[PDB]
Every structure is written in structure tokens, then in C-alpha cells.
């Protein structure tokens, strides 16, 4: 039980307003045949165009919401909407394009999917709220067959070209006209009462219904993200490395150790209250401080209410990726900014985003008002390690934010210049990934200079 059986029943009630008289009894096998696709009894890696919810969750990076609305049925034009915000009008002869025949529309579809997905996934998963026209449009821009490899590289083929009779991945499909072996899932198969808008609006107020196909496509994908990543969470599922995951994660641990160590040296808190991940380890194990841990799993729906985390109840509080409505004034905070544009950050539900780095984390919408009792933490590098080289060429470092014994003495040593530059790169990596750092208002790096006396 890893793939969806073609002999599984498909509920057709949602399809009957576009396809009246459709049989109530139907399998994926008959549906695919009626869609105009021939599977020919083929065991060549593509057993079904449709996938299970479990397979869709593993390929969340491939998700593209797709809706088709009748503009006027082979006689009338269709409006194709995608969760990228693109609307294309195909004539049978928030960006809205004028009516064009399928031979040119299919070229635009391939270009758009390739530009969106090349740095995200090895495939496309059309996320539908199927009513009929969207499935009947597929024969006009999709070709299927055995699993193939790209003609210019080792990646699986996602596109086909009728001009050259060749196959390409999302990176090498320029000039290609067909989407090859796409996958799809109909959200209506999961069991819902009422229409798309009524189910979507129960959980999200950010996506409106401007009455166009792309709005429906965005709502459909948003509803699926809510069902799979908000109301249900699975932190065991592993996702492949597609970018700077490792460097970001290493930078996060380096920055956390730096900031907490410096806050303890500068303000000498007798106790640190570490709130968040129940598997947390002391980030500054050599510090004198009394370290107390409080368990809170990552919140995927709404930010935690501080009144609930503290059970309505000195030292400093550490909230490292623990999303709360309003941080206490005595805090050290790392909060992911959901607005960040990156290949790891997918659009989410109700302003939230789906951050995918080894595991998927639906993160509640970034809110500047959560940080009203704090200030932004400025960049600084602190080190009490010996000034000694051991082991790239050099230009002497001059920086007011290199808090070291050698800088206090008037000339930064080669070791601390190298470590400062490595730390600044890690810091910039973490910030550009979307993380934001906040600290108690009394934090002052000037208090770190007397640790070298
Ligand atoms: C959704 C696919 N489709 C439209 C033509 O491709 C269709 C499905 C079932 C029946 N019985 C007739 C038509
Ligand atoms: C900020 C630390 N703190 C008060 C110390 O006793 C606290 C934290 C969590 C709960 N649940 C209660 C209290
Ligand atoms: Zn390729
Ligand atoms: Zn939404
Ligand atoms: Zn030094």
C-alpha cells in the first residue's frame, strides 16, 4: 500500500454539474480513460495519475492548485487558473490573459510550471477541487507514458516536446509544449460538506474569492495545506535537500549559542527559562546559570497565548522558534518571518507559511506586534577564545562589532578576524532564510568589554 490503486472508487458527485449523467460508480481506471489517457497495462513507474494523501504530503513542494472555469465544453473558451496567480484563457477555435488556442496555451503552462518548480521538486501535483472542466482540459496539455529521464541530465522527465520528440526536466524544458506524467489529487475525495469557499473560509481570511479560476486554485491548495499541515501534523516525514538547509541549520545553532552566551555574560541572569522544543539541549552548556526547560511543541495553527504557556503565572526567557502572541520583556527570541521568499518557504494557510527544511513546519503568520516589549537584536560577534592562528589570504579586519580581547587592545588578530567573517556569513545566511532576532531592551554589547579585564 504505497501507491493509489487505479481500481479505487472515485466519488463523482462533484463532477456531475459539469458532466451531467456521470455514473455514481466509477474507478480511477475508468476516469483516466474518460479523461482521454491510455495506461495500456503499464508497470513502468507511473501506475496512476492520481495519488494518495500520504504521497501528496511527501511531495508538498510539487503542489500547484489548479481550477478550470467555463467562460461561455469544446465549443466554449475555458479559464485555466493556477495557485501561482496565473489565469490563461484557452479558446477551442491576479493576472488575466486574453483568449488563445491550446497549441500556444500549452507552451505557457510548461514555462510557468518549470519556472515555479525547477528549484522545488522533481514533479508537479495538481491540487484540485474537481468539478469536471479541469479534468477534461488535461488532454490538451498533458502527455503520459513510462517514467523517463531528461535528455540533458539525470533528473526524471516532467515535460515533452512534440517538435523534437524529446523529454526534459523542469530545468531543461525551454521551448517544450507538453506536461509529461504529472500527478494530481482531488481534495473533494477527502469528505467535505458544502462548496470550496465555505470549507476554505472556515480556516483562512487571507484568500478572497475575486470570482476567477486562480482564486479557486489558491483556495484549493490552501485548504489542502490546512488539512495536511495544520489540523494534522507529521514531523517524522523527511524532505530532500534542495538548497541551503544544512548551512542554515548550522548557522541557527551558532547564532543561538552566540546570543545566549553574550546575554548571560552581559546581564548575569541567575536563571534562564528555555521555552519550546521538548527535545532541547542547553545551547551554552558551560554557563553558570540555572537552566530550566518548559515543553512546547511547534505551533502550526495560531501562535501560543503567553497566558496559556505560563499557566497564568526573574531571569531571562529564551523563545527559540517558539511562536507566541506577545513575548515578555525579559526575552531572547528567534521568530521565523513567514513573509520571506525562498525555495524552503511555501505559501501557507491564513497568512502562515509552510517552512520545509528536513521536516515540514506550518508557521503562523509573522506579527510585528508580538515584539512590542523587545527591540531588534543587532549584529555582533563575541569571543573569549585565545588569540592564536593554527593551520585563504588576509586583509586586516576593522570592525566596531568584533567584541574580542584583541579588538579591545586595538588590533584584531588573524584568528578572530577569520572567525568573525565566518560568523557574519552564518548570521546573514540565517537572516536571509527568514529568521528574525529580538532581545530585551536593556541588552547592550558595551557590557561585554569588561569580560576581558
Ligand atoms: C472528467 C473526464 N470526463 C470528461 C471528458 O474527458 C468524463 C468522465 C467521465 C465520463 N463518463 C465522461 C466524461
Ligand atoms: C517564565 C518562567 N515561569 C515562571 C517561573 O516560575 C513559568 C514558565 C512556564 C509555566 N507554565 C509557568 C511559569
Ligand atoms: Zn534536465
Ligand atoms: Zn487560504
Ligand atoms: Zn584575537
UniProtKB/Swiss-Prot annotation:
Location of the region described as GpppA-binding in the Swiss-Prot/TrEMBL record: 349-363
Top-level taxon of origin: Viruses
Residues engaged in binding Zn(2+) 15: 200, 204, 207, 222
Residues bound to Zn(2+) 14: 150, 153, 169, 172
Subunit-level organization: Interacts (via N-terminus) with DDX1. Interacts with nsp10.
Its biological purpose: Plays a role in viral RNA synthesis through two distinct activities. The N7-guanine methyltransferase activity plays a role in the formation of the cap structure GpppA-RNA. The proofreading exoribonuclease reduces the sensitivity of the virus to RNA mutagens during replication. This activity acts on both ssRNA and dsRNA in a 3'-5' direction.
Protein name (database record): Guanine-N7 methyltransferase nsp14
Native source organism of the sequence: Severe acute respiratory syndrome coronavirus 2
Lineage, highest ranks first: Viruses, Riboviria, Orthornavirae, Pisuviricota, Pisoniviricetes
Gene name of this polypeptide: rep
Complete-protein stretch covered: 5949 to 6449 of 7096
